[model samples]
Target chain A: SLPMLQVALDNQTMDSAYETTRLIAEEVDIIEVGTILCVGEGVRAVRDLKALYPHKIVLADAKIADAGKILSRMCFEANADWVTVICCADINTAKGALDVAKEFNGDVQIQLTGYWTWEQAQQWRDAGIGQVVYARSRDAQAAGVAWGEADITAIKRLSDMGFKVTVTGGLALEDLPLFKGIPIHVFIAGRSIRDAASPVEAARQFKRSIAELWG
Target chain B: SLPMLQVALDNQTMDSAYETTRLIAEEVDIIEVGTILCVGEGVRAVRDLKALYPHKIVLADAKIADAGKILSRMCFEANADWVTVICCADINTAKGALDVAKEFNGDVQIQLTGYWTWEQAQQWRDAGIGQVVYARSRDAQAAGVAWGEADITAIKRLSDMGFKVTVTGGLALEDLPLFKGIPIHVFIAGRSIRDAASPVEAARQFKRSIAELWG
Candidate 1:
């Protein structure tokens, strides 16, 4: 299956996030209201994005470590198609979000942040969550650890478990080919697409690159 | 040290949160724009709460798992006096928030949600984080496990290490006496105060009870 491009609008304000996503809205498959945006603009951002781009899958990057039910419900009720829960949270905490998502017919993504296990992965998969993300840490990137083979193996493992794995963090066009044969559900490009001189052009390249590789 | 009452405004909307806080604004010492409020209303809630309660400390419960510098900057720039980072996050992730906090003269609280360590706690303390929170999970409470003596010992341990410990999660007036001899900096009451028949009365009881116990 072809991978989808998710433009992560990590803007600190609604005006910027809305405008950024609006410009490249048609080029990408998903509109991510990044965790920073979620805090700065709230789920109101999700509501506004969904209203403007009703056809696009709007994801609220809640990134919450606890209070999963209430937090997931906040975004889901606001019409978010997907919400992110921290991977390291208690299984019960993850279940909390699952319970809310079940009620709304929405979904939750277990964002692999610090530490988790194969067993934990299986629990989420068993409990009905279909997506998991393997995000590169900004701190790790800053400290000079590039996304490498280990990341690909991990994503493939999650994929093998029947999860739609979303890959993110310090992603570049060059990084795309490295994941050529892998089955990625989403390639979340934050600064890569948003900060480019032409956001839409960067997004188009991502779409083209992903299509050529996956197809 | 005497404990201060911090009213946790965990409402799903800004209007309800603002109005609820307005009723008990005079009673509580710190006005926390909770994580849910932060996600639903954004840091605009932080700024609005700050504008209305200029003298009170406004803590944005941005329970972010990553991108600490950017997230912390957004909240601090919005005039949040304090923000939160998940305790299980990488030490560098916490430092990222602390780095931004240093620039704004704000603070960060390491929320003890799941797994963490004495070494991790020391690193945060060593890195100049003055606060930490030990919140009982809602799922745990719903499962019938009550806050007990072990909770007190862990909090006391953090207190001994010079961190200003905040207690939250299903907190009540009955829970206050258990920490009578402990040096808690803040007691975060969400539904216990906001859901009470008399919001201000509940707040006043928390303030009075904490004062009587700590003072």
Candidate 2:
């Protein structure tokens, strides 16, 4: 199956996010209302983007840690097809999110950004969580460190456990080839595309890479 | 020193939250625009409550996991004096939140909910975080469990670590005595006060307990 390309709109304002989403709407399959956008514009960002692009999947990257039910319900009620839950969150927190997602016919993804192990992943998977995100280290990203070979192996292992893995963190068009043949259901790019001189062409490059590898 | 009473307004609507805050503002020292209230009403909840009650400290319980800078900044801009960041978040995330709080002359609190250790607490303390929240088990509380002796011990230990600990999770006026010899800077009451037939009386009862015990 061809991996879906997801663009993370981590803009400071709704107008810029909407503009970028409109420009790259054709090239991407999933539109992520990034955490910054969610905070800056509230669920209105998710609602507006999803309303504008009804055919596209809209994800609220809430990274919910507690009060999962309320936060997840808020996003789903705002028209989000998927909401993010953190892996380090208590099992009950994940269960709370799952409860809301089930009600709305949406999905909850466990984002593995901090200290998390395979045991934790298995626990979430066993608890009926269907999606997991593997992010490049935020610290490493800040230090300008690139994704490592170990990250690819971990993604493959996570996918083997039946999780639809979403890959993110400083993901650029050039980084897609390194992730070739991995079971990535979604590739999330933020500045790599949004900061580009031409967002339309930048998004196209991501789509072209996915097509060349998966198609 | 007398412990401050912080009311957690975990309401589903902004009107009731505002009404309840107005009712209990005289008795309470801090007003927490709870996680549910924040999500349900947006930053407007924080903004309105803070604007109405400028004397009270408004806390946005964001429980932020990722993109710490923008979320914390948004809360501060919306007039929150304090915002929550999870203790398990990456160092960079805590740093990001700390950076914003410094600029805004606000404070960041590390919510100790999920998997966290004393070493990690020390790391956050070493990183210049001054506050940490220790919540009573929500699941246990839901299952009719009361605050135990170990909880008291924990409060002492955390205070010894030089952190101003804010205790929460289904805390009521009756539980205040159990924490009698401990150094509790803030006691958070949610349903106990908000769901009360007379929220003002409930808040005063909590204050009366703190005053009687300390005075």
Candidate 3:
């Protein structure tokens, strides 16, 4: 399958995220209400976006670590099609989240950051989770460290393991070609697209590149 | 220092949280705008709670994992006196959150629920971080599991290491005696207080117990 672009609306206010999504929604395959945005705006942000764009796949990046059933059910009830759980969460907690997602007929994506191993990812996969995210280290990304070979290697490995992989972390247009041959199902762009001078144009570029390379 | 009563308002609506906080504010030393509530209500929830009860310490349970500086700054700017980062977050990411808290003249709490060791907690303490939460597993708590000797032991060890420990996990009024000899600085109660028929009475019971136990 051709790689799809997931635009992360990570702004602090609902208006900013809504405006950016309105402009870029046509070019993106998924809309991620980023963790910060979700924290700043709440699950109502998810409901608003889902209502605004019924056809777009809307994900609430809750990054749930505990209280899996309550939190996941809240997101699903708010109309989120997908939710996230941090990969480092206890296996039981992760399974609880997956169960809630299943109950709602939604999907749960395990967000990989901090201390996590391929073994853990495989554990989640075996437990019936189909989506996994490869997040670049926030500290490294903040220090202007670029995503490199190791990230691509991980993406390939996770995809080979039969997981739908989403790659995120200060992602930019120039970084797309680095994964030309890698089997990434989703590419996530946050600041690069939302902070761009023209969000629609920025999203269009990502879409065109993904199409040019994979379609 | 005597143990403080920290009320966790994990409601799904702002009106209910605000009303409950207003009723129980006098009994609580700290008001926790819980992760679910924060995500359901946004930063305004924190701001409103802070504004309404300027005398109480208002905490945003962000459980931040990535984009440390940005997310922490948002909460602090909204007048959160304390914030939280999951213990499993990357060391650098945790440091980034601590730095933000320092910049805002606030505090960052490392919430311990996932895989963590005393050595890792010691490293954070060595890095100048002072607060750590020993959260009882939500799964265990929901499954009718109770806090035991091991939790008390962890609290003593973390306190001896110079951490101002806040203990939480479905803590109820009856559970206060279990920590009678423990050196807990804070006790967090969520659903037990928020969903109580009389929130003020529930909070008062916790306050009375902490005072009796530590005084």
Candidate 4:
């Protein structure tokens, strides 16, 4: 399946995000207003990015743990097409986000950062959420825990469960082919593109890979 | 221990937080620039709160779920004496936050919003974190699952294991007396004080109850 290439604008400030987004918008599919940027600039990061790129999907990586209803609504009302929730939160938190989603026409993706059950997945699907993310913790990423079959196994399981699984980590161009047969809906690029010698050029390479691999 | 009377500035905007902090700064020991406020305004919420009240302890409820090191450093770097991490995150997340705490001389508090074990509590305590909270989920709070023996049992156990236990929910002044016997290191009141007709008067009442009960 052709996975959408999402760029993570992990800028710490809104101006930083705006400059980064301006360069990469045409090259990427989803513009992620990163958790760190959102932490530094609030929902204004999502608000401005969406305002600038009305046609592009802007996501706020809020990674909400509690008060799901308020935070999700905050991002969605700010015009975020999607928002994130950490898997380690209570199911009520997930339900809280889902409860508010329909009215805003916003979507929620529960980050598989914490433990969860397939039953829970079915529950979320039953509640109208269509996607999930399988991420490698930065702690593990920085420590050099390379991805292996274990990740593929989990991704395959989620895909079978009918999720538009989004995969993110310190993903590199070479890593894309590793997921060749998997039904990934989104492939997220963070520092791999953003911290490159030429960000837009780096993004173009990712898009080219997506087209070659999926198309 | 005289439990700290922390004022939660749950304001959704920076200016909103300022006006609320302006009202309760003198009466509370720790000034918590709340998660929602931090979400809407970012670490500037912590930065400005500290600038205005240099003598007060400013805690950022970043409620970080990932990039523990980066997020923890961000809050502590912004001069937050304390920041929060959601409990459901990987143990590495806790370790990541703890690793950055010493350089800033900042403290980290893990919010017990999901399932956790005593061994996990011990692990966190060993990692330079001294406090944990037993919060009532807003979902449950909204559903009227009032606090009872289970919360008190966990608080007592955590305190027995030598942890500074912080309690927060839809806490009201009348509910303060109920926790008299438990070893609470902090009692957090949000709307009960901030939403009152006179926030300062409400805060004063909380301080009085703390004085009467603890003394």
Number of the top DockQ candidate: 4
Better of 3 and 4 by TM-score: 4
What digit string (tens of lDDT, one per residue) describes model 1 on residues B1-215?
A: 77888999888787999778779888888999988788888888888889999899999888768888888888888888899998766677888999998888888999888656678888888888899999887766776768888888999999999998999989988888888787788899999999999998899888888778877
TM-score of chain A of each: 0.96, 0.96, 0.96, 0.95
How would the candidate models be sorted by lDDT, starting from the highest? 3, 1, 4, 2
The better candidate by lDDT, 2 or 3, is 3
Give DockQ for candidates 1 onward, in order: 0.64, 0.44, 0.65, 0.66
Q: B1-215 in candidate 4: lDDT tens per residue?
A: 67888888888897877777778889889999888888898888889889999899888988877788999988988899988888866677877987787778888889987545677788887876788978887765876678898888888888888888999988999888888977688998888878999999998998888888988
- Decreasing DockQ order of the candidates: 4, 3, 1, 2
> Taking the tens digit of each residue's C-alpha lDDT, what string does model 1 give over A1-215?
89888989888888998678768999999999988788878888899889999999999988867787888888888899988888767667788888898888788898887656788889889878899988887776776778888888888999999999999988999999878888888899999888899998999998888888898
Predict model 2's lDDT versus the native: 0.82
Q: State the C-alpha lDDT per candidate.
A: 0.85, 0.82, 0.86, 0.84
Candidate 2 per-residue lDDT, tens place, B1-215, comes to 78888998877578878778667787788899887776666677788888988888888887777767778888999999999987667777887888999998999998887566767777887889989888754643554656788778877888998999888888877778888877788889988998899998898898888989988
What is every candidate's alpha-carbon RMSD to the true fold?
2.0, 2.1, 2.1, 1.8
Q: Which numbered prediction scores highest in lDDT against the true structure?
A: 3
Q: What ranges in model 1 sit over 4 Å off? A: none
lDDT of candidate 2 over A42-79, digit per residue (tens):
67888888989988899998887777777888899999
Q: After superposition, how far is residue B57 of candidate 3 from its true place, in Å?
A: 0.7
